[PDB]
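User: Here's a protein and a ligand (zinc ion). What would the complex look like?
Assistant: Let me lay out the input and then the predicted complex.
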Amino acid sequence: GIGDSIADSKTYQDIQNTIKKAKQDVIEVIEKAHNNELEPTPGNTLRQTFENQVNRI
Amino acid sequence: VGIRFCQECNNMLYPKEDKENRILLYACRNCDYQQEADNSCIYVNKITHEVDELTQIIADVSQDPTLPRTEDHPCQKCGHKEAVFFQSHSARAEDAMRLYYVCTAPHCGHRWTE
Amino acid sequence: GQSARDAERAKDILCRLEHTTLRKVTANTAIYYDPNPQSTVVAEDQEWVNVYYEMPDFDVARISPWLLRVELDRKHMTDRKLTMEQIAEKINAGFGDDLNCIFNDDNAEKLVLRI
Ligand SMILES: [Zn+2]
Ligand SMILES: [Zn+2]
């Protein structure tokens, strides 16, 4: 049914919190890449390392 | 580094060498108009290609309604406290995540990176 | 060998295996016109070309009024552990002797060699 597709009130808050913190970290990564403070890794373009760590996050 | 046009038939002046006074002479191959070279260099090839696009972006980009704006970084030449920033949007995109700004005050057009 | 263990010997054999051409280690090139090696159209290369010139060799037939000047990028130079000495002999040893290379000292920041 749909009673089997729903959660309690505590879990929703936890999911919102972790999503907010991830969307936070991505912003710090972006804004520290706009001041040329990123260092590429061996065999990786700057775009490559940026997108790699944002995909990690 | 530039180019030279003939003064008679308006064509391309080629460089030539004379074995008398050791000076570069620019000659034509339709007529034979002559003159000497002032810089005495012909060919240059820039491989670094590190041209700063501060010499290629236009001042009227601040009329674009689809670009982000900022209240933090003000203009130096006029003191306006509103700018519009963007990226290189060109080639040489290996480490190209700089952020060029343009003042949005009318008739300022000041540009600067950071 | 221990090259499989330490990253430095691994990286040196890495650079020793990879193919590297000239346009990857050059910054810019310019064809000047020196009818005399003492003319030195560009302002500051007179020092090293002159300290060669007080040791003047190979003025056999003439001196070619046409010059070729090459600038190098020490970034791309050292990453492969190259310096223009080996380049200088192999750009000669390998093409013939129709060319002649004098060069700077690497203590000078920009690495230029004229041919
Ligand atoms: Zn002409
Ligand atoms: Zn302004």
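Summary: Helices of chain A lie at 9-33, 46-56.
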